Amino acid sequence: PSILSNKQFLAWGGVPLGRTQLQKLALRNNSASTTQHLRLLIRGQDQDCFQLQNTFGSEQRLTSNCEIRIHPKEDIFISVLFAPTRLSCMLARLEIKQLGNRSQPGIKFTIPLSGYGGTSNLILEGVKKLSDSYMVTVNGLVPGKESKIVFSVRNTGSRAAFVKAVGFKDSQKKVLLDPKVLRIFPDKFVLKERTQENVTLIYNPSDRGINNKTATELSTVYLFGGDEISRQQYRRALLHKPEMIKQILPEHSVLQNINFVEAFQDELLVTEVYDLPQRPNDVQLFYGSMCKIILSVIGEFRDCISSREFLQPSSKA
């Protein structure tokens, strides 16, 4: 073994159209004696969207030269820019020609490159935007009576999104909502590119409670979102290898108990998933690319906020 790599492939997943994402790999000259002369080339059907950036190493500064001297036991660090310019799954090759010295013949190494142009982009409408979360208030609650409010999830991206909504009574202690008190409908759905879908919070505040029946309540809804193609890649990865979810996530993660495999509302029969090659890190890319939207839900009761007159307390300097 002459040349080693810390990565057998580079998989980018989704990058928005007109945007760019850098990824690196390290090549090591395994020889303790001999220097190799490497020629780095991008080839393949989507070579126009994978661009070699300047190379550096453990014994050399930044160079724009595609020809690299790699000294014995030197690591060189190769940078590839993924710059997609069309709504497609993309394949290319990093070709590493180890130039022959007659005594040793010419060996060509291949690192497959993959990614897709265009991504989902999820925002909420009909709710307040705070700095790092959204907020909605359900006013005029009455214990033992059903209240409904409607907000919207908008996908401003160029690809369909999955949306999985999970609600928490207490988010730190990870006590799920009783759906008979507060539930989200739909709680799992596919949202087409440049479309907006309505989501309903169905609020049935308990009249069983002893004391704080009309006390102002706070709940936390998490909307886990990402590219539908990413969820299809994830599905495909879990068929070939039964159990990968536990290994990857933290043991105490909320995502531990969330099903992304089962049928979502308005899921399509056709995606570009089969244009993407299966990779060992598809499950990692799925959870890695996933967004978490925070929606705080305040329940205000008529008797406590609406019916009580807000007056100035006892004031002194």
Author numbering: 1763 to 2079
Give the article text.
CEP192 and CEP44 are proteins with a key role in centrosome and centriole biogenesis. We have recently determined the structures of the N-terminal Calponin Homology (CH) domain of human CEP44 and the so-called Spd2 domain of human CEP192. Both structures were obtained through X-ray crystallography at a resolution of 2.3 and 2.1 Å, respectively, and were experimentally phased. The N-terminal domain of CEP44 shares a weak sequence similarity to various CH domains, most of which members of the IFT81/NDC80/Hec families, whereas the Spd2 domain retrieves sequence matches to members of the PapD-like superfamily.
